[PDB]
Amino acid sequence: AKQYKNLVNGEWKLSENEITIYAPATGEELGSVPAMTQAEVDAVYASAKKALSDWRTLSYVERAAYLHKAADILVRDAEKIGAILSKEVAKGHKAAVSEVIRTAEIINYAAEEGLRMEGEVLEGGSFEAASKKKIAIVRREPVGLVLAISPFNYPVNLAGSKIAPALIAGNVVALKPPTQGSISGLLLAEAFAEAGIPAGVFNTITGRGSVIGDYIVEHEAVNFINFTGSTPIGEGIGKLAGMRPIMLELGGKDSAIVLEDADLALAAKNIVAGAFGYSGQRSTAVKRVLVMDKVADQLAAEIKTLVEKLSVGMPEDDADITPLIDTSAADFVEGLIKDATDKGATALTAFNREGNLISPVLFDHVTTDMRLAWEEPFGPVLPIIRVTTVEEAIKISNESEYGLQASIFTTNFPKAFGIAEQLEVGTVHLNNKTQRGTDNFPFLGAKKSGAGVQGVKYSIEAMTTVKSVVFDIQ
Amino acid sequence: LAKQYKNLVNGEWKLSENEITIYAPATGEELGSVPAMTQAEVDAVYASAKKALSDWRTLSYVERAAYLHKAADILVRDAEKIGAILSKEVAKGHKAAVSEVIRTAEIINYAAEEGLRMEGEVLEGGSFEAASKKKIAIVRREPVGLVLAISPFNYPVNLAGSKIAPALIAGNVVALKPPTQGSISGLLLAEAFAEAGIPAGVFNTITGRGSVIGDYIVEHEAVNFINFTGSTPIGEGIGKLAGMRPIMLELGGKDSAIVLEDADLALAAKNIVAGAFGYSGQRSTAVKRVLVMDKVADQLAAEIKTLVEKLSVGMPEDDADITPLIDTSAADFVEGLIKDATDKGATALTAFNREGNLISPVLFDHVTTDMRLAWEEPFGPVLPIIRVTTVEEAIKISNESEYGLQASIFTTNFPKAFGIAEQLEVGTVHLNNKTQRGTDNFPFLGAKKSGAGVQGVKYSIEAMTTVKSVVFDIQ
Amino acid sequence: AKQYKNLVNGEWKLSENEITIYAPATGEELGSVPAMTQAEVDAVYASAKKALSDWRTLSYVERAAYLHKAADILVRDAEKIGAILSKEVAKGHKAAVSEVIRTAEIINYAAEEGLRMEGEVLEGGSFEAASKKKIAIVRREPVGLVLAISPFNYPVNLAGSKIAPALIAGNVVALKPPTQGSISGLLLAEAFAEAGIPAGVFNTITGRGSVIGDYIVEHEAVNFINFTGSTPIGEGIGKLAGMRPIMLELGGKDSAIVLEDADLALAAKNIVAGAFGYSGQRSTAVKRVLVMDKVADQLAAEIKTLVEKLSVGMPEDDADITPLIDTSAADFVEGLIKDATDKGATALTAFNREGNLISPVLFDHVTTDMRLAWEEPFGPVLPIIRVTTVEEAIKISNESEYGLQASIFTTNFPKAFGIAEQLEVGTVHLNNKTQRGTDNFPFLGAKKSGAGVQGVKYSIEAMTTVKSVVFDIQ
Amino acid sequence: AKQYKNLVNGEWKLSENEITIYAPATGEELGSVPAMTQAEVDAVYASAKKALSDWRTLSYVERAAYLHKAADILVRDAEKIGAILSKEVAKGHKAAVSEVIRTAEIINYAAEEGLRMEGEVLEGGSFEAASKKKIAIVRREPVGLVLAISPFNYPVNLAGSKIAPALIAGNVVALKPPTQGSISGLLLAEAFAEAGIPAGVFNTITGRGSVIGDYIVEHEAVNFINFTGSTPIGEGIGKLAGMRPIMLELGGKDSAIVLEDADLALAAKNIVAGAFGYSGQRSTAVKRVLVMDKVADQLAAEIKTLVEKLSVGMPEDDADITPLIDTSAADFVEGLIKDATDKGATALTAFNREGNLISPVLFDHVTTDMRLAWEEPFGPVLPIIRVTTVEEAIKISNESEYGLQASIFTTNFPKAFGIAEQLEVGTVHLNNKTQRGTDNFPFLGAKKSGAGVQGVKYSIEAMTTVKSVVFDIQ
């Protein structure tokens, strides 16, 4: 029952009230985080804006040095941090440690990507002859204070994915972790503090949404909002963003389109790995199979045999399927399962629920009148929807309010490229499950899946602006 | 004389049951009417745009560029016909109005050629992890969808085209909402795109009263991107309605001209007057406060005053430097700022006179920070001179403004000027020249309340495009 | 038979002596071109260097305007120029006109690509903290005088592909067209002259290689040599270039690799179109089929049927197969045919020669001991070489001293991509004949196929340098 | 004194004959390096070409890992290597250590710059509507075997500046250091070997030029020559290169243009620092002052005083002026000094020679008739040339056959930029001495000063080619 503290202007601060964090899989009390007041948020932001001047005027090399050091510390403490991250969000122990290792890779990569970013020289004479001696020297500058809001399912990886790109460009950062995941976010903060990040350059905020939820976003000191979480929450942030740029990484309902010529065993392997990873609690994940009917029976059988083998149990045992993050999540997933059952879908694997541990449910013969065809479960349930034409698969895919990623399984890549052109998604994976990585690749979602382009170099670009200095050569 | 104008809706020209009569601000002459669209008519515009998006985005870049080049050619052909009406509609000098149309064609042509040669990128998985060395990402550009372009009264053609052409070349469809005062000129611009053969629904116009369709056009879920130029308050209101849609805002400015002791004062005065009083000060990018070191302030003020006294004041048809302001409220607001400065003891170096809404160019010296004129954007022909004692003080006063569009530094020490520029909270700093949006290939952006996003041709195209990534494993 | 003149310092000038040019297909006298002396080359280069200062200091907009005007004039006169080009190099009349139209497209594209090129601003602080106030303003500049040497087979297209990229970047140009093709190159020059190109900015040189061949390249006024022609001639230029940058577009022996799963009809169509276009007188042309044995018989039969449909005749009649450029070329092609026949190759179509008009010869069972497996014929003969494995196809392909392009015909795209990585060529076309276009794409050759990267933006880059201005911010 | 060996295919090889190396300032015997035969050169290139396939197929991150490890080893052993490097080339001890530290900086920077290099995707529809479905996937590839030839004055820095950018891109490398500097080059090689570089990926060649000088360059196994050295030697390489790409970093005669409004004390400080560094044995170095008449007298006085403060002594004592590299070098510098004296130049500082240790000689009233106005001394002698106009300064500067860098001293930066545009050099430094750094900035010379563009990212680009894969989307 350790009492965790926020990093504020280089110091660690409790608050008068606290929030106790329990492990979703066991109920174990993991500790508490501060329930900051609005005035304490004011001090976090005041500290950040004060530190911005000296931070942005450091060299890229100096800023990159802090990031690399913090990544080295994360690697050192990956087992320690991952062990707690596992408990806090009911993520498998090994996956939790992997998340911290991956966070280190992102931080190091962002440091080296950002430090060699360049400006441009534009010629007046490109546009008008009379300005041929007028040139613009266009250099990059930070946007200022970035509010990073990490999600429960990747409370270290999708905190670092915002912090490091922000910091290399000369921004200051305040991290608001989710309450479930606040310990892991504060453990990440410990690595940055030990790396010697200058006071105020990076700070953390924890507290109850009823007290500081909107206040942290509406605060005029914030110049940029970088958020990962649910679609409805992301929509609420867009309403509070005003003129300030935002990045939103929200939900998905990624389709896996399986054509008649697909390698059905490989498609099943990727589909199951992608759909049921972390019990389906991922934005990027196969969430519906759109399969040509000629291969639907064989594919359903190949998916069923794998889903039946998934382990269902506790995070400490590295179970494939772990308890969902809270009771509301499991209730919602059970409801989608019940709707599909009641509307006549075929349950190829049996629904079971012990507490919030839902066994993985595979439905065949899902029709688009069923909620499970569209709504994001964030739970271990996968529908198979049979189609008769590629055109019908494209229409059903694009009919979703979500547009994060898609997978296309086929041996005809020229056709798959033509399909990918028509899919309203950010990324199409050919003969592979959907995935955010590799983290240098762009990561973006269309429609209700978010706004902005992430991936390392793209997140740095998003959190930098330009300063043009124009003069006339004589 | 006065004509009834129509909106371009899905390849057809449509009247509405009601209309809005547009009058010339300088003379009161009736110029014509534009439709007062209803929300149902806006729905039909957006429905047609979304239906045209599929065929438009699948055309080749070269095909889309051809339409844009043809539209620009027609604008050039009709620059005198369009400029003459634009001049009357927003009280812009006749020659300056024709020049606006010509510049619009330049932007359209440049956008077509910039956008058609944009490229994708191939990323190596092995750049990040060895196990992904055979995985590559093919990243190609795609449009965002339907762009709502909202142009401003002061550049109803130029800052319409600066949105329409970058959006169109990338494969977006567009609906233009001109300002009511400027709607005729916006519809004349649309005529050129229609005659160029732009496919039905790829480009449409919307005109109407704010009280009827103002919020409706922005909140409509068919709109995927909002691109707005206008006042700061109206811009902030659009931000509240954007939701998750990306937006670009080009809002107000209070550009400072910092004059150091080693500056060429005569050249500084020339650039400061050209930039401060162009179009009677009705420009976001324009010198709106001089921050001058006290040692050179007396001589600089005398140089500026001499030039301001030479500015012509009169009617648009006479190509006066100072023309009547856009409306009475604008001139009333400017008169109030002048009075506050006078009553607080500023020195009127040139006299305040008002004929209708034609305010003579007023130069104030010894302006202090308690005066509204030190901070508020007049959008009128009034320039304060603020004396400073250190460059640090000039930097602090400049940055205290809630605006951060552009700034000018007048000095012979460019290394120092570059260091100053780094500290100024603005988009662009011009050295030994007035602030300005051009050349239109250069970035144009404002910090703080001056807006959001980066324009200039290539930057506008980048803003109104997204990416589509296709990832596969080499075998 | 007009007496053509060179464009020299804005003026059209004859020389003391001339060279009469005849149509290879008919012997018709087309006119004469000047036989410039070395002293006259000196005057051309002097005028060009004199014009360079005023030319490079113009705005990009102003230089682009001249190029667009010259392209419009080419479009206006495409029929007149193409009619003469057709006779001069025995190219089909319609193909000749198309070459002129393509040249206008390349010029217009070069003008708009070049005018919006930019520089870069590099930060000292990316490399060392102590240099964080030091920035480098890096702008592009012309290399100076570009010598452009066009080839007989594309004497307008592959002149303009050098002139326009050079000119937009602010270089001055001297065009040395080949004697056979000098009339067409001068006809191109007329368009640039009528467009108003300033005196000396663009000039032409014509003459006998024994008199000015090496002299035009060794001359110290030349800052860049941009040459298209035979490999041996290009190797000779590499020696004479010294330290000066060069681009060489030389020979090719492009392989068309046909795998067992290929679309054989598609492969046969593309192979025949590519191998026999302009009677095989193209560097980028399928010049050997490497086909898996299992599909060789059927592929050969389908190629044979298409070859037998090619028209054999005169340029004026738009014949597919026209007479070769000269007698030496036909003699050399006949020698390769005889060597293949003598060594046991199967003649699927029969050799026939009337003057220099050789009928298209398709050989099957070509082996690596035959000259036709390796030497570039520049004539209408195609060898089919049977392989047992894809590994063998890659080896045989890469054993060539040439490495311009390659074609891979197969339905397995990821495998084709892996093969492409292994091929020592500049460009690999999947399920398509090799081709240089579209002209925005890179065009380059490995090994003896040349040096430098062409395609419009690449050509501009090659013929520019950079000028770095470094200062410290204070 | 050690018997040094070449790194050949992961082994350290002796040759039958060897070359004893002596310290130029003391005559101390430092060791011997192998005198390789042409057959031993073949074995080096054979090993490299065999290692290339496995090395180019590694991921970027795997190649970068080797480079970082080699840089770490160099940092560790900087004192040990610098101590020997100081003796071998008579470089100040601390300066020799600084060279090794800078080489590690370049190696680390090259690793991270090259690992995130990207390809491009070009649209057929950018050029013609009919090809809108055709796209080109353009990816970078190594050129092959790079021959890296380092110079005596930077035998580690300007060996590493070639090795690391070549390696990260997937090339294999053979390093030929100069005989005087071979120990330092082989000491650098030890760091790459200990870092675990795969056998044959990196090798060294040492020997006498009469036996292997031309042989190493004209060998057809070599795909790229990357050379730093004298202009005459470099000229010879451009001839032996054929069509193969090269980079040449040759001599310079950098002008320092001092205008009437210049900070004369700052000008003198930078001029003396840049002109006399390493006794003037640097390509980038102020080698002639072009000063406007009205400030010449005062500038010359300030330069003279600073020249008199330079220490003149042995490398181990960190003297500013150390003995030149060999007797030939000092004989040549003495001849240039004598020519200036006999032609009436004013010797502001005294010429004294003890062995090969020449005291720093400053000349005023140097005219264009004197050899010192033009010839690169590579010794501690500096001419001051008075000019009457800025136009005369530009003309004299550009009349040099060299065009590496220039310095402009003035407070009128717009005018300085306009002057820089006219100066036929690669880089112009404003109010600073000329210098290669920072190593991320472009480094290049015009005219006889070299060919190609270095600095880190530019060297990587130079030693890469592109592979284009074109296909039609369906």
Burial C117-141 (b: 16+ CB within 10 A, else e): bbbbbbbbbbbbeebbbbbbbbbbb
Helix (H) or strand (E) holding A85: helix A78-89
- Distance between CA atoms of residues B391 and A85, nearest Å: 51
Q: Is D269 part of the contact surface with chain A (CB cutoff 8 Å)?
A: no
Interface test with D, best of B57, B124, B140, B473 (most D CBs within 10 A): B124
Q: Is D220 part of the contact surface with chain C (CB cutoff 8 Å)?
A: no
CATH 3.40.309.10 in chain A is located at 254-441
Calculate the alpha carbon distances from D354 to B433, D21, D282, D309 in Å.
Answer: 58, 21, 21, 18
State both tokens at A433: 């499950």
As a residue count, chain B comes to 475
Q: Is C245 part of the contact surface with chain D (CB cutoff 8 Å)?
A: yes
Burial A10-49 (b: 16+ CB within 10 A, else e): beebebeebbebebbbeeeebbbbbbbbeebbeebbebbb
D41's CB contacts (< 8 A; 6+ apart) are D205, D207, D212, D215, D216, D219
Q: Do A430 and B127 touch (CB under 8 A)?
A: no
D29's CB contacts (< 8 A; 6+ apart) are D1, D20, D21, D22
Helix (H) or strand (E) holding C430: strand C427-430
Question: A–B: how many Cβ contacts below 8 A?
Answer: 162
- At residue A80, φ and ψ (nearest 5 deg) are -65, -50
Exposed/middle/buried for residue D193 (C-beta within 10 Å: 0-12, 13-18, 19+): buried
- Distance between CA atoms of residues B29 and B26, nearest Å: 8
CATH 3.40.605.10 in chain B is located at 3-251+452-471
- Distance between CA atoms of residues A272 and A289, nearest Å: 10
* DSSP E strand stretches across C55-191: 119-123, 134-142, 145-149, 172-176
Q: Is D415 part of the contact surface with chain A (CB cutoff 8 Å)?
A: yes
State both tokens at A106: 């992102």
- Distance between CA atoms of residues A387 and D378, nearest Å: 78
Q: Is the peptide bond before A438 cis (omega within 30 degrees of 0)?
A: yes
Calculate the alpha carbon distances from B259 to A406, B247, B297, B399, D414 in Å.
Answer: 57, 35, 9, 15, 17
- Distance between CA atoms of residues B464 and B471, nearest Å: 23
Q: Do D426 and C126 touch (CB under 8 A)?
A: no
- Distance between CA atoms of residues A96 and A87, nearest Å: 9
**Cβ of D220: how many Cβ atoms within 10 Å?**
8
- Distance between CA atoms of residues D427 and D254, nearest Å: 10
C102 neighbourhood in chain D, CB within 8 Å: none
Helix (H) or strand (E) holding C258: strand C254-258
How close B187 comes to chain D (CA, Å)? 30
- Distance between CA atoms of residues C152 and D135, nearest Å: 29
Contact call for residues D153 and D33 (beta carbons, < 8 A): no
Helix (H) or strand (E) holding A353: strand A353-354
- Distance between CA atoms of residues C461 and C466, nearest Å: 10
| Sequence-ordered alpha helix ranges (H) in A150-292 | 157-168, 182-194, 214-218, 231-241, 264-276
C62 neighbourhood in chain A, CB within 8 Å: 125, 129, 132
- Kindly compute the dihedral angle of the four CA atoms of residues A90, A92, A95, A101, in this order, to the nearest 10 degrees: 60
C-alpha atoms less than 13 angstroms from C-alpha of B340 in its C-beta half-sphere: 19
D473's CB contacts (< 8 A; 6+ apart) are A414, A417, A418, A421, D133, D134, D135
Contact call for residues B460 and B163 (beta carbons, < 8 A): yes
Number of helices (H), then strands (E), in chain B: 14, 25
- At residue A385, φ and ψ (nearest 5 deg) are -115, 120
Neighbours of chain A (3+ CB pairs under 8 A): B, C, D
Helix (H) or strand (E) holding A145: strand A145-149
Of A116, A414, A473, the CB nearest to D474: A414
CATH 3.40.309.10 in chain B is located at 255-441
**Cβ of C239: how many Cβ atoms within 10 Å?**
16
Per the CATH hierarchy, to which homologous superfamily does domain A254-441 belong? Aldehyde Dehydrogenase; Chain A, domain 2 (3.40.309.10)
- Kindly compute the dihedral angle of the four CA atoms of residues D281, D283, D285, D286, in this order, to the nearest 10 degrees: 110
Helices A93-115, A157-168: axis angle to 10 degrees equals 10
- Distance between CA atoms of residues D31 and D1, nearest Å: 4
- D124 → chain B, closest CA residue: B60
Q: Which is it for the CA torsion D63, D68, D69, D73, positive or negative?
A: positive
CATH code assigned to B255-441: 3.40.309.10
Q: Do D58 and B130 touch (CB under 8 A)?
A: yes
Q: Name A18's bridge partners.
A: A34
Experimental method: X-ray
Q: Is A474 part of the contact surface with chain D (CB cutoff 8 Å)?
A: yes
A444 neighbourhood in chain B, CB within 8 Å: 466-467, 469
Helix (H) or strand (E) holding A78: helix A78-89
SS (H, E, C) chain D: CEECCEEECCEEECCCEEEEEECCCCCCEEEEEEECCHHHHHHHHHHHHHHHHHHHHCCHHHHHHHHHHHHHHHHHCHHHHHHHHHHHHCCCHHHHHHHHHHHHHHHHHHHHHHHCCCEEEEEHHHCCHHHCCEEEEEEEEECCEEEEECCCCCCCHHHHHHHHHHHHCCCEEEEECCCCCHHHHHHHHHHHHHCCCCCCCEEECCCCHHHHHHHHHHCCCCCEEEEECCHHHHHHHHHHCCCCCEEEECCCCEEEEECCCCCHHHHHHHHHHHHHHHHHCCCCCEEEEEEEHHHHHHHHHHHHHHHHHCCECCHHHCCCECCCCCHHHHHHHHHHHHHHHHCCCEECCCCCEECCEECCEEEECCCCCCHHHCCCCCCCEEEEEEECCHHHHHHHHHHCCEECEEEEECCCHHHHHHHHHHCCCCEEEECCCCCCCCCCCCECCEECCEECCECHHHHHHHCEEEEEEEEECC
- Distance between CA atoms of residues D73 and D70, nearest Å: 5
C260's CB contacts (< 8 A; 6+ apart) are C292, C294, C295
Q: Do D139 and B120 touch (CB under 8 A)?
A: no
Contact call for residues B454 and B442 (beta carbons, < 8 A): no
Residue type at C214 in one-letter notation: D
Q: What angle do CA D343, D346, D350 make, to 5 degrees?
A: 110
Among the listed residues A239, A309, A238, A300, the one whose alpha carbon sits nearest the alpha carbon of residue A276:
A309
State both tokens at A155: 């409370």
Calculate the alpha carbon distances from C455 to C153, C374, C440, C448, D134 in Å.
Answer: 18, 26, 5, 19, 15
D76's CB contacts (< 8 A; 6+ apart) are none
How close A447 comes to chain C (CA, Å)? 30
Contact call for residues B401 and B450 (beta carbons, < 8 A): no
Residue B59 per-residue DSSP state: S
Q: Is A54 part of the contact surface with chain C (CB cutoff 8 Å)?
A: no
How close D44 comes to chain A (CA, Å)? 34
CATH 3.40.50.300, applies to D2-250+451-471:
no
How close D182 comes to chain C (CA, Å)? 26
Instruction: Find the radius of gyration of the CA atoms of chain A.
Output: 23
Contact call for residues B406 and B430 (beta carbons, < 8 A): yes
Secondary structure (3-state) at B466: strand
- Distance between CA atoms of residues A193 and B239, nearest Å: 36
- Distance between CA atoms of residues D375 and D336, nearest Å: 8
State which CATH number among 3.30.420.340, 3.40.605.10, 3.30.420.40, 3.20.20.370 fits the domain covering B3-251+452-471: 3.40.605.10
CATH 3.40.605.10 in chain C is located at 2-250+451-471
Of D116, D131, D413, the CB nearest to B127: D116
Among the listed residues B359, B345, B212, the one whose alpha carbon sits nearest the alpha carbon of residue B280:
B359
**Cβ of D309: how many Cβ atoms within 10 Å?**
9
- Distance between CA atoms of residues C441 and D137, nearest Å: 9
Q: Do A113 and D113 touch (CB under 8 A)?
A: no
- Distance between CA atoms of residues A313 and A25, nearest Å: 9
- Which of 131-160 (B) contact C at CB < 8 A? 134
Residue C155 per-residue DSSP state: T
Residue A267 per-residue DSSP state: H
- Distance between CA atoms of residues A26 and A41, nearest Å: 32
Interface test with B, best of D55, D60, D63 (most B CBs within 10 A): D60
Secondary structure (3-state) at A32: strand
Q: Do D121 and B138 touch (CB under 8 A)?
A: yes
Contact call for residues B5 and B206 (beta carbons, < 8 A): no
Q: Is D444 part of the contact surface with chain C (CB cutoff 8 Å)?
A: yes
Contact call for residues D406 and D429 (beta carbons, < 8 A): yes
Q: Is C249 part of the contact surface with chain D (CB cutoff 8 Å)?
A: no
What resolution in angstroms, rounded to 1 decimal? 1.5
Q: Do C473 and B117 touch (CB under 8 A)?
A: no
B439 neighbourhood in chain C, CB within 8 Å: none
Secondary structure (3-state) at C54: helix
Exposed/middle/buried for residue B323 (C-beta within 10 Å: 0-12, 13-18, 19+): buried
Residue type at C81 in one-letter notation: I
- D427 → chain C, closest CA residue: C468
Of C440, C441, C469, the CB nearest to D428: C469
Contact call for residues A432 and B471 (beta carbons, < 8 A): yes
- Distance between CA atoms of residues D22 and A109, nearest Å: 45
State both tokens at A298: 């064989």
Calculate the alpha carbon distances from B364 to B371, B380, B385, C260, D92 in Å.
Answer: 11, 13, 6, 85, 64
Q: Name A418's bridge partners.
A: none
Contacts by C227-234 with C-beta closer than 8 Å and gap 24+?
A: C227/C147, C227/C148, C227/C149, C228/C149, C228/C150, C228/C151, C228/C154, C228/C158, C228/C162, C228/C283, C229/C149, C229/C151, C229/C178, C231/C376, C231/C401, C231/C402, C231/C448, C231/C449, C234/C450, C234/D243
- Distance between CA atoms of residues A30 and A44, nearest Å: 25
- Distance between CA atoms of residues D330 and B250, nearest Å: 66
Calculate the alpha carbon distances from D106 to A291, C200, D109, D194 in Å.
Answer: 53, 44, 5, 18
CATH 3.40.309.10 in chain C is located at 254-445
How close B134 comes to chain D (CA, Å)? 9
How close A417 comes to chain D (CA, Å)? 6
B240 neighbourhood in chain A, CB within 8 Å: 239, 242
Residue with tokens 């003699």, as numbered in its chain: C331
Neighbours of chain C (3+ CB pairs under 8 A): A, B, D
D354's CB contacts (< 8 A; 6+ apart) are none
Of D421, D473, D474, the CB nearest to A473: D421
DSSP C194-257: HTTPPTTTEEE----IIIIIHHHHH-TT--EEEEES-HHHHHHHHHHHTTS-EEEE----EEEE
Among the listed residues A123, C169, C138, the one whose alpha carbon sits nearest the alpha carbon of residue D427:
C138
**Cβ of C328: how many Cβ atoms within 10 Å?**
10
C276's CB contacts (< 8 A; 6+ apart) are C307, C310, C320, C321, C360, C380, C382
Helix (H) or strand (E) holding C304: helix C293-309
- At residue D157, φ and ψ (nearest 5 deg) are -60, -45
Of B117, B124, B414, the CB nearest to D126: B117
Largest CA distance in chain B: 80
B345's CB contacts (< 8 A; 6+ apart) are B366, B368
Among the listed residues A231, A180, A241, the one whose alpha carbon sits nearest the alpha carbon of residue A24:
A180
Calculate the alpha carbon distances from B73 to A251, B66, B76, B107, B408 in Å.
Answer: 46, 11, 5, 12, 35
Q: Is B239 part of the contact surface with chain A (CB cutoff 8 Å)?
A: yes
Q: Is the peptide bond before C438 cis (omega within 30 degrees of 0)?
A: yes
Residue type at A149 in one-letter notation: I
- Distance between CA atoms of residues D305 and D268, nearest Å: 9
- At residue B293, φ and ψ (nearest 5 deg) are -60, 140
Residue with tokens 């170099």, as numbered in its chain: A457
- Distance between CA atoms of residues A75 and D196, nearest Å: 23
- The architecture (CATH level 2) of C254-445 comes to 3-Layer(aba) Sandwich (3.40)
Of A59, A120, A138, the CB nearest to C132: A59
Of A426, A468, A471, the CB nearest to B427: A468
- At residue C293, φ and ψ (nearest 5 deg) are -55, -35
- At residue C380, φ and ψ (nearest 5 deg) are -85, 65
Q: Which is it for the CA torsion A257, A261, A264, A266, positive or negative?
A: negative
Among the listed residues C25, C34, C26, the one whose alpha carbon sits nearest the alpha carbon of residue C2:
C34
Instruction: Find the radius of gyration of the CA atoms of chain B.
Output: 23
State both tokens at B214: 């103002």
- C135 → chain D, closest CA residue: D441
- Distance between CA atoms of residues A401 and A397, nearest Å: 9
C107's CB contacts (< 8 A; 6+ apart) are C67, C68, C70, C71, C74, C160, C163, C164
As a residue count, chain A comes to 474
- Distance between CA atoms of residues C292 and C362, nearest Å: 17
Among the listed residues D60, D72, D54, the one whose alpha carbon sits nearest the alpha carbon of residue D9:
D54
Helix (H) or strand (E) holding C43: helix C38-56
- Distance between CA atoms of residues D472 and D195, nearest Å: 44
- Kindly compute the dihedral angle of the four CA atoms of residues A99, A105, A111, A116, in this order, to the nearest 10 degrees: -140
A236 neighbourhood in chain B, CB within 8 Å: none
- Distance between CA atoms of residues C289 and C366, nearest Å: 10
